[PDB]
Each structure stands twice: as structure tokens, then as C-alpha cells.
Write a protein that holds these residues in place. Structure first.
Motif, PDB file in Angstrom:
ATOM      1  N   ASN A 217     -53.931 -22.356 103.198  1.00 15.31           N
ATOM      2  CA  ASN A 217     -54.478 -21.012 103.260  1.00 15.31           C
ATOM      3  C   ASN A 217     -53.404 -19.999 102.889  1.00 15.31           C
ATOM      4  O   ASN A 217     -52.313 -19.983 103.475  1.00 15.31           O
ATOM      5  N   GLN A 218     -53.743 -19.104 101.966  1.00 14.12           N
ATOM      6  CA  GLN A 218     -52.764 -18.085 101.563  1.00 14.12           C
ATOM      7  C   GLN A 218     -52.642 -17.020 102.638  1.00 14.12           C
ATOM      8  O   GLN A 218     -51.541 -16.544 102.913  1.00 14.12           O
ATOM      9  N   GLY A 219     -53.758 -16.687 103.288  1.00 17.16           N
ATOM     10  CA  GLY A 219     -53.732 -15.714 104.360  1.00 17.16           C
ATOM     11  C   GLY A 219     -53.922 -14.321 103.802  1.00 17.16           C
ATOM     12  O   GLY A 219     -54.867 -14.090 103.065  1.00 17.16           O
TER      13      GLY A 219
ATOM     14  N   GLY B 140     -51.463 -12.042  98.376  1.00 17.34           N
ATOM     15  CA  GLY B 140     -52.085 -12.423  97.125  1.00 17.34           C
ATOM     16  C   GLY B 140     -51.160 -13.420  96.461  1.00 17.34           C
ATOM     17  O   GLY B 140     -50.761 -13.196  95.355  1.00 17.34           O
TER      18      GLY B 140
ATOM     19  N   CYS C  11     -52.026 -16.420  95.653  1.00 16.46           N
ATOM     20  CA  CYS C  11     -52.903 -17.460  95.205  1.00 16.46           C
ATOM     21  C   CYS C  11     -52.306 -18.103  93.954  1.00 16.46           C
ATOM     22  O   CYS C  11     -52.531 -19.280  93.677  1.00 16.46           O
TER      23      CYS C  11
ATOM     24  N   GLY D 136     -49.228 -10.332  93.413  1.00  9.60           N
ATOM     25  CA  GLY D 136     -49.808 -11.045  92.283  1.00  9.60           C
ATOM     26  C   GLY D 136     -48.714 -11.668  91.396  1.00  9.60           C
ATOM     27  O   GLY D 136     -47.487 -11.425  91.579  1.00  9.60           O
ATOM     28  N   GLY D 137     -49.145 -12.433  90.397  1.00 13.43           N
ATOM     29  CA  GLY D 137     -48.197 -13.029  89.487  1.00 13.43           C
ATOM     30  C   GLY D 137     -48.941 -14.002  88.630  1.00 13.43           C
ATOM     31  O   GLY D 137     -50.019 -14.374  88.990  1.00 13.43           O
ATOM     32  N   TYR D 138     -48.399 -14.328  87.459  1.00 14.39           N
ATOM     33  CA  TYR D 138     -48.998 -15.308  86.538  1.00 14.39           C
ATOM     34  C   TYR D 138     -48.427 -16.657  86.908  1.00 14.39           C
ATOM     35  O   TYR D 138     -47.402 -16.759  87.549  1.00 14.39           O
TER      36      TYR D 138
ATOM     37  N   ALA E 180     -57.293 -19.762  86.118  1.00 13.81           N
ATOM     38  CA  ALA E 180     -57.532 -18.433  86.713  1.00 13.81           C
ATOM     39  C   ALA E 180     -58.960 -17.970  86.440  1.00 13.81           C
ATOM     40  O   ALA E 180     -59.330 -17.818  85.301  1.00 13.81           O
TER      41      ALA E 180
ATOM     42  N   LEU F 269     -60.288 -11.998  85.092  1.00 13.30           N
ATOM     43  CA  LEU F 269     -59.502 -13.084  85.657  1.00 13.30           C
ATOM     44  C   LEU F 269     -58.772 -12.475  86.841  1.00 13.30           C
ATOM     45  O   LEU F 269     -58.018 -11.545  86.677  1.00 13.30           O
ATOM     46  N   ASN F 270     -59.067 -12.931  88.052  1.00  9.55           N
ATOM     47  CA  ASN F 270     -58.408 -12.375  89.244  1.00  9.55           C
ATOM     48  C   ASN F 270     -57.968 -13.405  90.281  1.00  9.55           C
ATOM     49  O   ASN F 270     -57.069 -13.135  91.079  1.00  9.55           O
ATOM     50  N   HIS F 271     -58.623 -14.553  90.323  1.00  6.82           N
ATOM     51  CA  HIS F 271     -58.189 -15.554  91.291  1.00  6.82           C
ATOM     52  C   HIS F 271     -57.665 -16.843  90.619  1.00  6.82           C
ATOM     53  O   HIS F 271     -58.329 -17.433  89.776  1.00  6.82           O
ATOM     54  N   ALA F 272     -56.451 -17.246  90.976  1.00  2.00           N
ATOM     55  CA  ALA F 272     -55.860 -18.467  90.434  1.00  2.00           C
ATOM     56  C   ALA F 272     -56.080 -19.661  91.349  1.00  2.00           C
ATOM     57  O   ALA F 272     -55.812 -19.586  92.552  1.00  2.00           O
TER      58      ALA F 272
ATOM     59  N   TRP G 176     -57.973 -20.921 100.211  1.00  2.51           N
ATOM     60  CA  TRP G 176     -58.427 -20.145 101.354  1.00  2.51           C
ATOM     61  C   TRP G 176     -58.608 -21.011 102.595  1.00  2.51           C
ATOM     62  O   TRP G 176     -59.453 -20.737 103.462  1.00  2.51           O
TER      63      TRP G 176
ATOM     64  N   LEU H 237     -57.083 -18.860  80.916  1.00  2.00           N
ATOM     65  CA  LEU H 237     -55.693 -18.740  81.321  1.00  2.00           C
ATOM     66  C   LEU H 237     -55.160 -20.033  81.939  1.00  2.00           C
ATOM     67  O   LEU H 237     -54.622 -20.028  83.018  1.00  2.00           O
TER      68      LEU H 237
HETATM   69  C1  LIG Z   1     -54.721 -13.909  94.221  1.00  2.00           C
HETATM   70  O1  LIG Z   1     -54.492 -13.584  95.558  1.00  2.00           O
HETATM   71  C2  LIG Z   1     -53.599 -13.217  93.308  1.00  2.00           C
HETATM   72  N1  LIG Z   1     -54.173 -13.459  91.975  1.00  2.00           N
HETATM   73  C3  LIG Z   1     -53.534 -13.239  90.832  1.00  2.00           C
HETATM   74  O2  LIG Z   1     -52.342 -12.800  90.773  1.00  2.00           O
HETATM   75  C4  LIG Z   1     -54.344 -13.593  89.595  1.00  2.00           C
HETATM   76  C5  LIG Z   1     -53.918 -14.998  89.101  1.00  2.00           C
HETATM   77  C6  LIG Z   1     -53.168 -15.358  87.807  1.00  2.00           C
HETATM   78  C7  LIG Z   1     -54.087 -15.935  86.792  1.00  2.00           C
HETATM   79  C8  LIG Z   1     -52.231 -14.304  87.259  1.00  2.00           C
HETATM   80  N2  LIG Z   1     -54.214 -12.601  88.536  1.00  2.00           N
HETATM   81  C9  LIG Z   1     -55.128 -12.612  87.572  1.00  2.00           C
HETATM   82  O3  LIG Z   1     -56.059 -13.420  87.590  1.00  2.00           O
HETATM   83  C10 LIG Z   1     -55.319 -11.801  86.303  1.00  2.00           C
HETATM   84  C11 LIG Z   1     -55.287 -12.600  85.167  1.00  2.00           C
HETATM   85  C12 LIG Z   1     -55.466 -12.097  83.891  1.00  2.00           C
HETATM   86  N3  LIG Z   1     -55.682 -10.744  83.793  1.00  2.00           N
HETATM   87  C13 LIG Z   1     -55.719  -9.918  84.883  1.00  2.00           C
HETATM   88  C14 LIG Z   1     -55.532 -10.459  86.155  1.00  2.00           C
HETATM   89  C15 LIG Z   1     -56.020 -13.060  94.251  1.00  2.00           C
HETATM   90  N4  LIG Z   1     -57.424 -13.479  94.008  1.00  2.00           N
HETATM   91  S1  LIG Z   1     -58.726 -13.121  95.064  1.00  2.00           S
HETATM   92  O4  LIG Z   1     -59.828 -14.104  94.845  1.00  2.00           O
HETATM   93  O5  LIG Z   1     -59.102 -11.716  94.761  1.00  2.00           O
HETATM   94  C16 LIG Z   1     -58.158 -13.178  96.731  1.00  2.00           C
HETATM   95  C17 LIG Z   1     -57.301 -14.228  97.157  1.00  2.00           C
HETATM   96  C18 LIG Z   1     -56.827 -14.265  98.558  1.00  2.00           C
HETATM   97  C19 LIG Z   1     -57.166 -13.313  99.509  1.00  2.00           C
HETATM   98  O6  LIG Z   1     -56.606 -13.504 100.743  1.00  2.00           O
HETATM   99  C20 LIG Z   1     -57.298 -14.397 101.751  1.00  2.00           C
HETATM  100  C21 LIG Z   1     -56.734 -15.634 102.076  1.00  2.00           C
HETATM  101  C22 LIG Z   1     -57.341 -16.476 102.928  1.00  2.00           C
HETATM  102  C23 LIG Z   1     -58.526 -16.146 103.494  1.00  2.00           C
HETATM  103  C24 LIG Z   1     -59.110 -14.960 103.215  1.00  2.00           C
HETATM  104  C25 LIG Z   1     -58.511 -14.075 102.351  1.00  2.00           C
HETATM  105  C26 LIG Z   1     -58.034 -12.252  99.110  1.00  2.00           C
HETATM  106  C27 LIG Z   1     -58.523 -12.205  97.681  1.00  2.00           C
END
Ligand SMILES: *[C@@](O)(CNC(=O)[C@H](CC(C)C)NC(=O)c1ccncc1)CNS(=O)(=O)c1ccc(Oc2ccccc2)cc1
Length: 215
Positions: free
Chosen positions: A18-20, A23, A25, A65-67, A134, A160-163, A184, A209
Motif C-alpha cells: 500500500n502506498q498510503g 503519490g 505509485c 509523482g515521477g516517471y 501507466a 495517464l495518472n496512475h502507474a 493500494w 507509457l
Molecule cells: C500515483 O500516486 C503517482 N502517479 C504518477 O506519478 C503517474 C505515473 C507515471 C506514469 C509517471 N504520472 C502519470 O501517470 C502521468 C503520465 C503521463 N502524463 C501525465 C501524467 C497517482 N495515481 S492515482 O491513481 O491518482 C492515486 C494513487 C494513490 C493514492 O493514494 C492512496 C493509497 C492507498 C490507498 C488509498 C489512496 C491516491 C491516488
């Protein structure tokens, strides 16, 4: 059997985490690719350190965040990455404190799959092991998933937002799917995993990606 592969059986996959409230991920997704290889090119799987990448990969935003490709470049240019036990996961940004003594793995580069080519992804998954991907995990239908082959027409290949990490592939009930491992915790979806639609015009932007490290 048909064309299908599940690496969890094999031993190339580490238990769900779990990331918690961080971000990170992305740090979790890169670490998973790293482990897939470390098993494939050693015989022994071991838990690698997401926290290590979170603190030392300045090219990225920390919990912001990060790639994933940026994560691989660091493991290389640094020459090693820590194991969990060595560098514990506190889910929060702090000072980079890499312990070379506990260096558990390393890579010599990476390779991205062709932007949007699902078939190129499938081959990578079958000939390389777990690939880092992603997707668009914004839709509530994604978040409340518990079973089946997910597919949502309103999913955006441009958001693209979740890896996450593709662990395999195969069919279900006439449905092709990408076996995905999320970070998660093992309380979300089917024990941490989700089955995403495979061959439905690159849903949620699965192949936009991808990359895997070389070891
Ligand atoms: C991840 O937390 C951070 N994601 C990124 O940094 C992504 C991944 C890579 C591919 C860079 N960025 C991008 O996807 C991106 C790519 C290309 N162009 C623009 C952007 C967030 N993802 S989330 O699904 O929104 C998320 C994840 C975790 C979270 O925390 C919890 C953890 C555990 C339980 C509940 C919540 C909330 C939201």
C-alpha cells in the motif's frame, strides 16, 4: 492452453503493498519490474526498496509523482538499489539515505514499448517478465472494482495518472485481459489485483507509457 501468462504463479511477483498517502505509485511500479528481473536473472525473488527511489531520484517529485523510466536511469547511474528491510518504507519524503551495504539489485538501462502498440506490450510481457505501465485510474468504476474484466468506455488514454505493473495476460469468459497489480494494499480489487480489458483499442491507455529495465 492459449496465449496467456501469469507471473504470480512463477514467482516473479512480490506481495501486494500500500502506498498510503503518498503519490509514490511510480516508485512501487519500477520496483516491481526490478524484482521480476532479479528473480529471472538470479532465481531468488527479494523485496526491493520503493522508499529509496522516492528519496534519491531527484529527477522526480518525491511523493508528488515521477516517471518510471526516470527511476531506472537512477538505479543504473547510482549502481544499485536497496532492499526493503535495508531501506524501510515510511510513505513520506525525507533525506536520501542509500545504504550501499544493503544494495540488493541493479540494472543496466531500460526500454520503452512503442507508444500505443498493444501487441508490442504483449511480447515484452511474455519474453521479458513484468513491465511497468501507466493508466487512467480516475473513474469510479475502476476504484470500486472487485471482480471481472474491467472496461469503461469513458476512460481516457490521454489521462495517464496512475502507474501499475502488468503481471501477465490471458482470457476469461471470452474476454482478454491484462493482469494488473496495484499498490493500494491487498484490500482493493481482487486481492490487490485488477483485470483490465485487453485488445479493446488500448483502454485507459495501457500501452502509452510502458517500459522495463534490463539486467
Ligand atoms: C500515483 O500516486 C503517482 N502517479 C504518477 O506519478 C503517474 C505515473 C507515471 C506514469 C509517471 N504520472 C502519470 O501517470 C502521468 C503520465 C503521463 N502524463 C501525465 C501524467 C497517482 N495515481 S492515482 O491513481 O491518482 C492515486 C494513487 C494513490 C493514492 O493514494 C492512496 C493509497 C492507498 C490507498 C488509498 C489512496 C491516491 C491516488
Amino acid at each position: 492452453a492459449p496465449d496467456s501468462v501469469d507471473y504470480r504463479k512463477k514467482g516473479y511477483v512480490t506481495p501486494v503493498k500500500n502506498q498510503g498517502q503518498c503519490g509514490s505509485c511510480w516508485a512501487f511500479s519500477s520496483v516491481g519490474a526490478l524484482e521480476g528481473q532479479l528473480k529471472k536473472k538470479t532465481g531468488k525473488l527479494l523485496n526491493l526498496s520503493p522508499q529509496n527511489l522516492v528519496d534519491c531520484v531527484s529527477e522526480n517529485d518525491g511523493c508528488g509523482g515521477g516517471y518510471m523510466t526516470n527511476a531506472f536511469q537512477y538505479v543504473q547511474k547510482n549502481r544499485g538499489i536497496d532492499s526493503e528491510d535495508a531501506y524501510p518504507y515510511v510513505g513520506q519524503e525525507e533525506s536520501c539515505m542509500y545504504n550501499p551495504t544493503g544494495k540488493a539489485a541493479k540494472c543496466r538501462g531500460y526500454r520503452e514499448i512503442p507508444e500505443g502498440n498493444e501487441k508490442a506490450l504483449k511480447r515484452a510481457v511474455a519474453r521479458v517478465g513484468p513491465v511497468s505501465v501507466a493508466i487512467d485510474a480516475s473513474l469510479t468504476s475502476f476504484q470500486f472494482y472487485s471482480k471481472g474484466v474491467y472496461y469503461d468506455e469513458s476512460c481516457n488514454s490521454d489521462n495517464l495518472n496512475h502507474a501499475v505493473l502488468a503481471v501477465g495476460y490471458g482470457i476469461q469468459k471470452g474476454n482478454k485481459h491484462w493482469i494488473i497489480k496495484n499498490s493500494w494494499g491487498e484490500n482493493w480489487g481482487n486481492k490487490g489485483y485488477i483485470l483490465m480489458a485487453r485488445n479493446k483499442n488500448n483502454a485507459c491507455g495501457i500501452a502509452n507509457l510502458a517500459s522495463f529495465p534490463k539486467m
